[PDB]
Structure formats: structure tokens, C-alpha cells
């Protein structure tokens, strides 16, 4: 039915396949000297997924001249049948890793400066990003979180929306400003902190 893959900007293509039982993704980069497969494993009742690890985690294995033909192959007895296929331009399908290494730089009674790191991405992409940040507060849900979206070259944010002496959690996600099918990264692991008491 649907065959969707994303590239983390370095050396990791992750594919998801859902159809209405032994299947693989075959990766065939045009005019390169290697091919690679991964075994599609159940991820939901509906879909399968696996990752094509192209090299070391911070290695720039692909560029904008690369074209990776991606095939879903499944076992039809002793023959392998092509179930889905796409020519994959990697930088048209970016989805970065979730930001990591969150830490409270400085917390006060109504504000908090939180910084993070962008992993497995060239310094180029750090300068062409959009960020989204949200907070969790007592009595509310992540869906009710106030959302902040920011187009900036900056891996920190000073939240102004806080109340004193309160427990919070903070999450951030990233999206490059390029690529037709580029999507948001997953949310970072939530960072817990508490605002200071009112003086």
C-alpha cells in the first residue's frame, strides 16, 4: 500500500512498509560500489520497518547527486517478488534525529533557558533548521502544550511562559528547511525542571 523512507542526513535511511511474510528492503544506490538490504520487521499490527545503516553514524555517505533505488522484496516461495519501489533522492526526504543533550542552562521563577544539540547532521544543516518546542505543566497534556516554532540558527531557547515554583517538562524537535518530503524529527526525550519559588 504505502512505502515511505526517510534519511537522517548522514548514513541512516529508515523505511516503513504497510500492506493489506518474509520481506526485505533492497537499497541500490546508482553509480556506487555497494548495495545493502535490511529485514522488514513488525512495528505495528499494520506495518513493517527496518533501517539501512550506510556507514558510521556521522559519516556523509550520500549527497544531492545520489539516487537510491529502494525495493520491497518478499518471498513468493523460492522467488523474490517486488512489492514496492521508488527512486529515492535522499535530501528530498530528510528526517533528522531528535535533538539530544538537553540541559537547563539557567532557571528562574518565570523563565528558563534550555539548550540542546543537533546530532548526526553536518554543521551546514544546523544553520538551515526550524525548531518546535513545547512544555508540559501539572494538570495539562502534551497535546495541550503551548507550542513555539522558530526559524533560527540557535540551539537554545529562553521560555517566558512559566509560573513560579512549578514542575515542567520540555521537548524540542527539528526540521531542515529543504527537501520536498522533509518532515519533523521525533520529539526529544522530555527534560524535567522546576521553576524557582517566587521571591
Amino acid at each position, epitope marked *: 500500500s504505502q512505502f515511505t523512507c526517510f534519511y537522517n542526513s548522514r548514513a541512516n535511511i529508515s523505511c516503513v512498509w504497510s500492506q493489506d511474510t518474509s520481506c526485505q528492503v533492497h537499497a541500490w544506490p546508482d553509480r556506487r560500489r555497494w548495495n545493502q538490504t535490511c529485514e522488514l520487521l513488525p512495528v505495528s499490527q499494520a506495518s513493517w520497518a527496518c533501517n539501512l545503516i550506510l556507514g558510521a553514524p556521522d559519516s556523509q555517505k550520500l549527497t544531492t547527486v545520489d539516487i537510491v533505488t529502494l525495493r520491497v522484496l518478499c518471498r513468493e516461495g523460492v522467488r523474490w517478488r517486488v512489492m514496492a519501489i*521508488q527512486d529515492f533522492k535522499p535530501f528530498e526526504n530528510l528526517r533528522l534525529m531528535a535533538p539530544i543533550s538537553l540541559q537547563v542552562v539557567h532557571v528562574e521563577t518565570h523563565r528558563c533557558n534550555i539548550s540542546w544539540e543537533i546530532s548526526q547532521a553536518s554543521h551546514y544543516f544546523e544553520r538551515h533548521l526550524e525548531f518546535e518546542a513545547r512544555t508540559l505543566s501539572p494538570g495539562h497534556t502534551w497535546e495541550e502544550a503551548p507550542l513555539l516554532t522558530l526559524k533560527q540558527k540557535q540551539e537554545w531557547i529562553c521560555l517566558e511562559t512559566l509560573t513560579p515554583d512549578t514542575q515542567y517538562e520540555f521537548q524540542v524537535r527539528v526540521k531542515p528547511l529543504q527537501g520536498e518530503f522533509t518532515t519533523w524529527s521525533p520529539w526529544s526525550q522530555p527534560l524535567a525542571f522546576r521553576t524557582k519559588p517566587a521571591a
Partner: nanobody
Amino acid sequence: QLQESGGGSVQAGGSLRLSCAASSYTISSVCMGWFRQAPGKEREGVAGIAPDGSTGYGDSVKGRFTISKDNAKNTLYLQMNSLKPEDTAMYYCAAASPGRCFLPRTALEPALYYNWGQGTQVTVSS
């Protein structure tokens, strides 16, 4: 959407020409291909054309068939020459999703396509 035409009856050694009317966008932007399905056989690839105009053909029809597009007329063609009885089958055109295909060898894969024509019959007499 996709509408085949030009499919009829010819004798062996003849030469026919299929037409597939499509949108202005698909004719200019997306991979397209011709496929055939003989009775008791699966749909096999005949010819494929990539967005850059590059082409590819199945082994059985190489040299005889020619795939082409006309952006002015919004039409895909399959010029088939020197037809043989083996070429008797239902012929289908198909158009790929935009941005999902750039090479004619991929455009030859039936698994690529979710938009197909109704098919046109082509019979060749021995």
C-alpha cells in the same frame, strides 16, 4: 485520467501505435510506462520513460518498440514495429507518483504504479 487508444487488430510483421492521453503535469513530470498482460501471465514491463526523457525497454521488445511523449498534446505513445504473435496481450499505460521515480529501469517495474489505464487489446495474427 489515463486513457489508452490505438489498440486494434493487425497481422504479423505489422506496425501499430498506441496513444495514452494524460494530464499536462504527468506527461511532463512523472515516470510513465507501457505494460502487457498475456492470458495466464502476469503484467510485464514493455517500455518506460523517465521525467528527463530517458527510456528503457524490456528484453523481448528492444529495437522494435519506441516510447515517447508529447508535452504539447499531453500524450504518451508506444510505436511498435515488426509485431509478432508473441506480442498479443492487453497493453496498459501507467503513470508514477511525482518525485518517486527518476530512472527508466524503475519506470519498467509494475510495482511502481498505482494509476493504470483500462487497457487496450492488441491481437497479432500468425
